């Protein structure tokens, strides 16, 4: 074969990275969990149009814009220990976070409280590259993970030319409905999360949170529909963090 | 080794030499690939060493990097390169120890800074293996206020009571800007602390009298083989103590 195959326990990246569980994505993405052959640890994997079926152009932009991803420090976005371009395809290789997919999490029905608290996090992430002009991309459950320490963190960093700014503001209200209601509020593509869609109203507009579950505080759900929407009107992740912080407060 | 050479296939750039305890060097250089700095150890670049403590250096380090905690550097890569044994970590936004140390940092904020690295230690030890903190240059002051190991690379001579001194010696840097400990590899920059009159490093608290006698404890019985702190553990407990 020309490019390895991707299966648990094959090796890839010059033998460097053992795949151990693939995680899903959105073609043309793929997140594994993989095992560094050098040191010894976990990372995220992402590998961007394994099979290279992508304009060159679009590839090389989607690696670039990634890049531009690898400054920042923060708890809200796995740390991006290395960009190569492979076979084929790029992959994006960043630390492992320990915790379980958004998915998982959600499905452990956790305190409206500790949800919100664990996303504000996203936020500062997403707004630390958002002034570095670049998206992060959250397009998907399976994009996220929660630490072991109550972060929401992407987990998966690839961002293509076609993500931007305002539809991450969009994936963290939809991650914050995910914890609190349980289900995933926006169109989903590729691999299923295992979120169901959310209940929509007769609008076609998600359902809020507190009218599905009343014991989860108006702010909370409010934070959460307003983000969501589309014409929400939170055009800002340091505003939206903001938000979340005034409604954790009460 | 000097600025603007090119380490592992063109990968890396040099950018400034921070000294080190010979055969190892620490350099501060430039990812070409991702545009953003890294620390580089060089374990032997000049082939001094026996193939055995090479690798038991690696080995070593690479025992280290599994540790998780603020206190150290992440490791993002060790490969023998045509320049030797090499260790990469990810850089500290920061400063080095001895720029911090210059501008005469509360006592309180210091020892509170000091904590992560302690921390680091007592996870290290517990796992087999020591920081190797012999030398100002290998730690750094992060934006966030954690001293941590910036530059780990772990030969045989490293060791838990050694790393105890190491600690309690920078500690002493940040305090009164000297190093308490005879002076180790090149390029340290730090003045020699002014010795008692039997040989021994001037307790900080008498060097300047507004460091509580607590946080100068710490640093002195740290530094101190005659009766000090053996364990990091304890050393961690006192630094606790200290800001409580």
């Keep these: 074969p020309d490019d390895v195959q991707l299966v648990p326990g094959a090796r890839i990246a010059n033998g460097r990275y053992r795949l151990l569980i ?21 990372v995220a994997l ?36 290395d960009v190569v ?15 379980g997919s958004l998915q998982e999490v959600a499905d452990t029905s956790p305190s409206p409280v500790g949800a919100i608290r664990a996303m ?9 590259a958002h002034r570095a002009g670049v998206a992060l991309s959250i397009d998907h459950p399976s994009r996220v993970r929660v630490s072991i320490d109550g972060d929401v963190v992407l987990a998966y960093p690839a961002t293509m ?3 931007n700014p305002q539809d991450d503001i969009r994936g963290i209200g939809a991650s914050l409905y995910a914890l609190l209601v349980n289900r995933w509020p926006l ?19 998600p359902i809020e949170p507190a009218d599905i579950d009343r014991d989860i505080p108006f702010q909370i759900s409010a934070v ?27």
């Design 46 to 81: 992402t590998f961007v149009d394994p099979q290279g079926v992508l304009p060159d152009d679009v590839l090389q932009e989607t690696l670039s814009r990634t890049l531009r991803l690898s400054r920042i420090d923060k708890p809200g976005v796995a740390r991006v220990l």
């Design 161 to 163: 030319p076609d993500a």
């Design 224 to 250: 959460a529909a307003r983000s969501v929407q589309g014409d929400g009107g939170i055009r800002s992740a340091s505003t939206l963090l903001n938000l979340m912080q005034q409604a954790t407060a009460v």
């Design 22 to 42: 693939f995680h899903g994505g959105v073609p043309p993405l793929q997140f594994w969990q993989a095992l560094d052959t050098a040191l010894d640890r976990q």
């Design 120 to 128: 504000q996090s996203l936020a500062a992430a997403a707004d630390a």
């Design 187 to 205: 169109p989903e593509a590729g691999v299923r999360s295992g979120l169901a869609p959310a209940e929509r109203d007769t609008a076609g507009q």
């Design 85 to 99: 371009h492979t076979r084929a395809g790029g992959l994006v290789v960043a630390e492992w976070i320990r915790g």
